[PDB]
Amino acid sequence: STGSATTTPIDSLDDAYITPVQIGTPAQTLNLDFDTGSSDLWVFSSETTASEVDGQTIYTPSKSTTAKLLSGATWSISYGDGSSSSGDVYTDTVSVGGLTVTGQAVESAKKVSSSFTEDSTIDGLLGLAFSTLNTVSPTQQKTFFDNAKASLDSPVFTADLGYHAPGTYNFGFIDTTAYTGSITYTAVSTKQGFWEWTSTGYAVGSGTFKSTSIDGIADTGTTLLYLPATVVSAYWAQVSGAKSSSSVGGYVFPCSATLPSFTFGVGSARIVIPGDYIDFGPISTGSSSCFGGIQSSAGIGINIFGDVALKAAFVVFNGATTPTLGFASK
């Protein structure tokens, strides 16, 4: 089997992407944030505290003839941005782009943090990291991909995120028309539960490539590119007037600037992020200070190849017995 679904930016900045997901019988379609940095499929629901729902579409398990409470199971998650959610668990039928999994754990939110409430466009998350990170207790549950894997034509999914445009998540096949050149594959460590890999270096603009190992994770659920302070300083030094602002929370730059590209290495291959992908717009409405899309990871503990980086590539998440990642230009 295969599946193919369009993923759409939630706003004009590409802050996140939503993909329609069919849950239950008859189908309830929710728009979920596919997140290769986490491993829970959780949804706004009829169980979510009413004051914490503000425009999201909810899953109502009592209206699904295939929903079953997973007795005793609870979940609770905290994300790298400080947001969180928790609740109980049903199993139900879940379909993405024509690919159906029966018995998928659907984690129903009883509580969500304010950032989720405040984003009416995201009805939940669909985690695509390794199932060892799933938070369901006392019996950890499998991701949608893990459950689908055996049925897929090939045990892979691909992320093709758009710049200010829709893109595609495919399951079970490589669309060889969706990228240019060849795909370069690179080793993955699953030791932390992430799609963790080592970039071979970077370049700023038309500058020389610096060969240096940068361990990080491929994370579709993180907007920006978070890299070591040395790398980030080297990038922003090429933008007149750019500075790190403690009050804003990162590097800012004059909105009148033209940003240089940023290149990262994948083996001997190179992925070029155009400068315009690094512009996240005014820090507040009407400001002439703009927020940078490349930020320091120094306070995170891990480097994160988020959407800024991934949307410059066609990315293969190869879930074979020994997982690997693939990157192609597009």
Coordinates of C-alpha atoms in Angstrom, one line a residue:
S1 CA 0.0 0.0 0.0
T2 CA 0.9 3.7 -0.2
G3 CA -0.5 7.0 0.9
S4 CA -0.1 10.6 -0.4
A5 CA -1.4 13.7 1.3
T6 CA -1.0 17.4 0.7
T7 CA 0.5 19.4 3.5
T8 CA -0.4 23.1 3.7
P9 CA 1.3 26.0 5.6
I10 CA -0.8 27.3 8.4
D11 CA 0.1 31.0 7.8
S12 CA 2.1 33.3 5.5
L13 CA 5.4 32.5 7.4
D14 CA 5.3 28.7 7.0
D15 CA 5.2 28.5 10.8
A16 CA 3.9 24.9 10.6
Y17 CA 2.1 22.7 8.1
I18 CA -1.2 20.8 8.4
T19 CA -2.2 17.6 6.7
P20 CA -5.8 16.2 6.7
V21 CA -6.2 13.0 8.5
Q22 CA -9.3 10.8 8.6
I23 CA -10.1 9.3 12.0
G24 CA -12.9 7.0 12.9
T25 CA -16.0 5.6 11.2
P26 CA -17.6 7.6 9.6
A27 CA -14.5 9.6 9.0
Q28 CA -13.8 12.7 11.1
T29 CA -11.2 14.8 9.2
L30 CA -8.8 16.7 11.4
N31 CA -5.8 18.8 10.2
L32 CA -2.8 17.5 12.0
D33 CA 0.8 18.8 12.3
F34 CA 3.0 15.9 11.1
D35 CA 6.0 16.0 13.5
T36 CA 9.1 13.9 12.8
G37 CA 10.4 15.1 16.2
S38 CA 7.8 13.4 18.4
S39 CA 5.9 10.1 18.5
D40 CA 2.3 10.7 19.7
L41 CA -0.8 11.1 17.6
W42 CA -2.9 13.3 19.7
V43 CA -6.0 15.3 18.9
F44 CA -8.3 18.0 20.2
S45 CA -11.4 16.1 21.2
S46 CA -14.9 16.1 22.8
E47 CA -12.9 15.5 26.0
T48 CA -10.8 18.6 25.8
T49 CA -11.5 21.2 28.5
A50 CA -14.0 23.5 26.8
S51 CA -12.2 26.7 27.6
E52 CA -9.0 25.3 25.9
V53 CA -10.8 24.8 22.5
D54 CA -10.9 27.9 20.3
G55 CA -11.8 27.0 16.7
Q56 CA -10.1 23.6 16.3
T57 CA -12.0 20.7 14.8
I58 CA -12.4 18.0 17.5
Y59 CA -12.5 14.2 17.4
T60 CA -15.6 12.8 19.1
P61 CA -14.9 9.1 19.8
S62 CA -18.5 8.4 20.8
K63 CA -19.5 9.2 17.2
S64 CA -17.1 6.6 15.7
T65 CA -18.3 3.1 15.5
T66 CA -14.7 1.8 15.4
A67 CA -13.4 3.7 18.4
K68 CA -12.5 1.7 21.5
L69 CA -11.2 3.1 24.8
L70 CA -7.6 1.8 25.5
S71 CA -8.4 1.0 29.1
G72 CA -6.2 2.6 31.7
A73 CA -4.0 4.3 29.1
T74 CA -3.0 8.0 29.6
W75 CA -0.5 10.3 27.9
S76 CA 1.3 13.5 28.7
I77 CA 3.8 15.3 26.5
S78 CA 6.0 18.4 26.7
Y79 CA 7.5 19.8 23.6
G80 CA 10.8 21.7 23.1
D81 CA 8.9 25.0 22.9
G82 CA 7.4 24.6 26.3
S83 CA 4.0 23.6 25.1
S84 CA 2.3 20.5 26.4
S85 CA -0.9 18.3 26.3
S86 CA -2.3 15.3 28.1
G87 CA -5.3 12.9 28.2
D88 CA -6.5 9.4 27.6
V89 CA -6.4 7.1 24.6
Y90 CA -8.7 5.4 22.1
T91 CA -7.8 3.0 19.3
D92 CA -9.5 3.8 16.0
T93 CA -9.0 3.6 12.3
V94 CA -6.8 6.4 10.9
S95 CA -6.2 7.1 7.2
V96 CA -3.7 9.5 5.7
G97 CA -3.8 10.1 1.9
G98 CA -5.6 6.8 1.2
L99 CA -3.3 4.7 3.6
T100 CA -5.4 3.1 6.4
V101 CA -4.2 1.8 9.7
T102 CA -6.7 0.0 12.0
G103 CA -6.2 0.0 15.7
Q104 CA -4.1 3.2 15.8
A105 CA -3.7 4.8 19.2
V106 CA -5.5 8.1 19.0
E107 CA -4.5 10.2 22.1
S108 CA -7.5 12.3 23.1
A109 CA -6.5 15.6 24.8
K110 CA -8.2 16.4 28.1
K111 CA -5.8 19.4 28.5
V112 CA -3.7 21.4 26.1
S113 CA -1.4 24.3 26.8
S114 CA -2.2 27.8 25.7
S115 CA -0.1 27.8 22.6
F116 CA -2.2 25.0 21.2
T117 CA -5.5 26.7 22.2
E118 CA -4.3 29.9 20.5
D119 CA -3.6 28.2 17.2
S120 CA -7.0 27.4 15.7
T121 CA -5.5 25.9 12.5
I122 CA -3.9 22.8 14.2
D123 CA -6.2 20.1 15.4
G124 CA -3.5 17.9 16.9
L125 CA -0.1 16.3 16.1
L126 CA 0.8 13.1 14.2
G127 CA 4.2 12.0 15.5
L128 CA 6.7 10.4 13.1
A129 CA 9.7 9.9 15.2
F130 CA 10.6 6.5 16.7
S131 CA 7.9 4.8 18.8
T132 CA 10.4 4.6 21.8
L133 CA 9.4 8.3 22.4
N134 CA 5.7 7.6 22.6
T135 CA 4.3 8.8 25.9
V136 CA 1.4 6.5 26.5
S137 CA 1.5 4.8 29.8
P138 CA 1.5 2.0 31.0
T139 CA 1.7 0.5 27.5
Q140 CA 3.7 2.5 25.0
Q141 CA 2.0 2.8 21.6
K142 CA 3.2 2.7 18.0
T143 CA 3.3 5.6 15.6
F144 CA 1.1 5.7 12.5
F145 CA 4.2 5.0 10.4
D146 CA 5.3 2.1 12.6
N147 CA 1.8 0.5 12.4
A148 CA 1.6 1.0 8.6
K149 CA 5.2 0.0 7.8
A150 CA 4.6 -3.7 7.2
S151 CA 1.8 -3.0 4.7
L152 CA 3.7 -0.3 2.8
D153 CA 5.3 -1.1 -0.6
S154 CA 8.5 0.2 0.9
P155 CA 9.1 1.1 4.6
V156 CA 9.6 4.8 4.0
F157 CA 7.8 8.1 4.1
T158 CA 8.9 11.4 2.4
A159 CA 8.5 15.0 3.4
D160 CA 8.3 17.6 0.6
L161 CA 7.5 20.8 2.4
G162 CA 6.7 23.9 0.3
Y163 CA 8.0 27.4 0.6
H164 CA 4.9 29.6 0.9
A165 CA 3.1 26.8 -0.9
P166 CA 1.6 23.4 -0.3
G167 CA 3.7 20.3 -0.4
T168 CA 3.3 16.5 0.1
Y169 CA 3.8 13.7 2.6
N170 CA 4.1 10.3 0.9
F171 CA 4.0 6.9 2.6
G172 CA 5.4 3.8 1.0
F173 CA 7.1 5.1 -2.1
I174 CA 9.6 7.6 -3.5
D175 CA 8.2 10.0 -6.1
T176 CA 11.1 10.2 -8.4
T177 CA 9.5 13.2 -10.2
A178 CA 9.5 15.3 -7.0
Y179 CA 13.2 16.1 -6.8
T180 CA 16.2 16.9 -9.0
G181 CA 19.5 15.1 -9.2
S182 CA 20.0 12.1 -6.9
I183 CA 19.1 11.4 -3.2
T184 CA 22.0 11.3 -0.9
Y185 CA 21.4 8.9 2.1
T186 CA 23.1 9.4 5.4
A187 CA 23.2 7.3 8.6
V188 CA 20.7 7.7 11.4
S189 CA 21.1 7.1 15.2
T190 CA 17.9 6.1 16.9
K191 CA 19.5 6.3 20.4
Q192 CA 17.5 9.3 21.4
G193 CA 14.3 8.3 19.5
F194 CA 14.8 10.9 16.8
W195 CA 15.8 10.9 13.1
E196 CA 19.3 12.0 14.2
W197 CA 22.0 12.4 11.7
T198 CA 25.3 14.2 11.1
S199 CA 25.7 17.0 8.6
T200 CA 29.1 17.3 7.0
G201 CA 29.3 21.1 7.2
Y202 CA 28.0 24.4 6.0
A203 CA 28.6 27.5 3.9
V204 CA 27.2 31.0 4.2
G205 CA 26.1 32.6 0.9
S206 CA 28.8 32.2 -1.7
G207 CA 31.4 31.5 0.9
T208 CA 33.7 28.5 1.2
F209 CA 32.3 25.3 2.6
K210 CA 33.4 24.5 6.1
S211 CA 33.8 20.8 6.7
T212 CA 32.6 20.0 10.2
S213 CA 30.4 17.4 11.7
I214 CA 27.0 18.8 13.0
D215 CA 24.8 16.2 14.7
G216 CA 21.2 17.1 14.7
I217 CA 17.6 15.9 14.1
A218 CA 15.3 16.2 11.1
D219 CA 12.2 17.7 12.7
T220 CA 9.2 18.7 10.6
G221 CA 7.5 19.9 13.8
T222 CA 10.1 22.7 14.5
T223 CA 9.8 25.8 12.4
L224 CA 13.4 27.1 12.4
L225 CA 17.0 25.8 11.9
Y226 CA 18.8 25.6 15.2
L227 CA 22.6 25.2 14.9
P228 CA 25.7 25.7 17.1
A229 CA 26.4 29.3 18.2
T230 CA 29.6 29.4 16.1
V231 CA 27.8 28.5 12.9
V232 CA 24.9 30.9 13.6
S233 CA 27.3 33.8 14.4
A234 CA 29.1 33.2 11.1
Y235 CA 25.8 33.4 9.2
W236 CA 24.4 36.5 10.8
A237 CA 27.8 38.3 10.6
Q238 CA 27.1 38.5 6.8
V239 CA 23.9 40.5 7.4
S240 CA 24.5 44.2 8.1
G241 CA 22.7 45.2 11.3
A242 CA 21.9 41.7 12.5
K243 CA 22.3 41.0 16.2
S244 CA 21.3 38.6 18.9
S245 CA 18.6 40.2 21.0
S246 CA 18.1 38.7 24.5
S247 CA 14.8 40.6 24.8
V248 CA 13.4 39.2 21.6
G249 CA 14.9 35.8 22.1
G250 CA 17.3 35.3 19.2
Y251 CA 18.9 36.9 16.1
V252 CA 17.0 39.7 14.5
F253 CA 17.9 41.7 11.4
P254 CA 16.7 44.8 9.5
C255 CA 13.7 44.0 7.4
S256 CA 15.4 46.0 4.6
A257 CA 18.2 43.4 4.4
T258 CA 18.6 40.8 1.7
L259 CA 19.7 37.6 3.4
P260 CA 22.4 35.2 2.1
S261 CA 21.7 31.6 1.5
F262 CA 22.8 28.9 3.9
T263 CA 24.2 25.6 2.6
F264 CA 24.4 22.4 4.7
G265 CA 26.2 19.2 3.8
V266 CA 24.7 15.7 3.4
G267 CA 27.6 13.5 2.8
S268 CA 29.4 15.0 -0.2
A269 CA 26.1 16.6 -1.3
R270 CA 24.9 20.1 -0.6
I271 CA 21.4 21.5 0.2
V272 CA 21.0 25.2 -0.4
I273 CA 18.5 27.1 1.7
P274 CA 17.7 30.4 -0.1
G275 CA 18.1 33.6 1.9
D276 CA 14.4 34.3 1.6
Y277 CA 13.6 31.1 3.5
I278 CA 15.4 32.6 6.5
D279 CA 13.2 35.6 6.8
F280 CA 10.5 35.2 9.5
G281 CA 9.2 38.7 9.2
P282 CA 8.6 41.5 11.7
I283 CA 9.1 40.6 15.3
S284 CA 5.8 42.4 15.9
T285 CA 3.3 43.9 13.5
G286 CA 4.8 46.9 11.8
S287 CA 8.2 46.5 13.2
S288 CA 11.3 47.0 10.9
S289 CA 13.2 44.4 12.9
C290 CA 12.7 40.9 11.5
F291 CA 13.2 37.5 13.1
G292 CA 15.8 35.2 11.8
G293 CA 15.2 31.7 10.6
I294 CA 18.6 30.4 11.8
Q295 CA 19.0 30.5 15.5
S296 CA 21.4 29.1 18.1
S297 CA 20.8 25.7 19.6
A298 CA 23.1 26.4 22.5
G299 CA 20.2 26.5 25.0
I300 CA 18.4 23.4 23.5
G301 CA 20.9 20.6 23.9
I302 CA 20.5 19.4 20.3
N303 CA 20.8 20.9 16.8
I304 CA 17.5 20.9 14.9
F305 CA 17.1 20.8 11.2
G306 CA 13.5 22.2 11.3
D307 CA 11.3 23.3 8.5
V308 CA 13.6 26.1 7.3
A309 CA 16.1 23.4 6.3
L310 CA 13.8 20.6 5.4
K311 CA 11.6 22.6 3.0
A312 CA 14.7 23.2 0.8
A313 CA 14.9 19.5 0.2
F314 CA 13.0 16.4 -0.7
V315 CA 13.6 14.3 2.4
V316 CA 13.3 10.5 2.7
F317 CA 12.7 9.0 6.1
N318 CA 13.8 5.4 5.5
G319 CA 12.4 3.1 8.2
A320 CA 14.1 -0.1 7.1
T321 CA 15.6 -2.3 9.8
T322 CA 18.6 0.1 9.9
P323 CA 17.0 3.5 9.3
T324 CA 18.6 6.2 7.2
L325 CA 17.7 9.7 5.9
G326 CA 17.9 10.8 2.3
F327 CA 18.1 14.4 1.0
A328 CA 17.7 15.6 -2.5
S329 CA 17.5 19.1 -4.0
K330 CA 14.2 20.0 -5.7

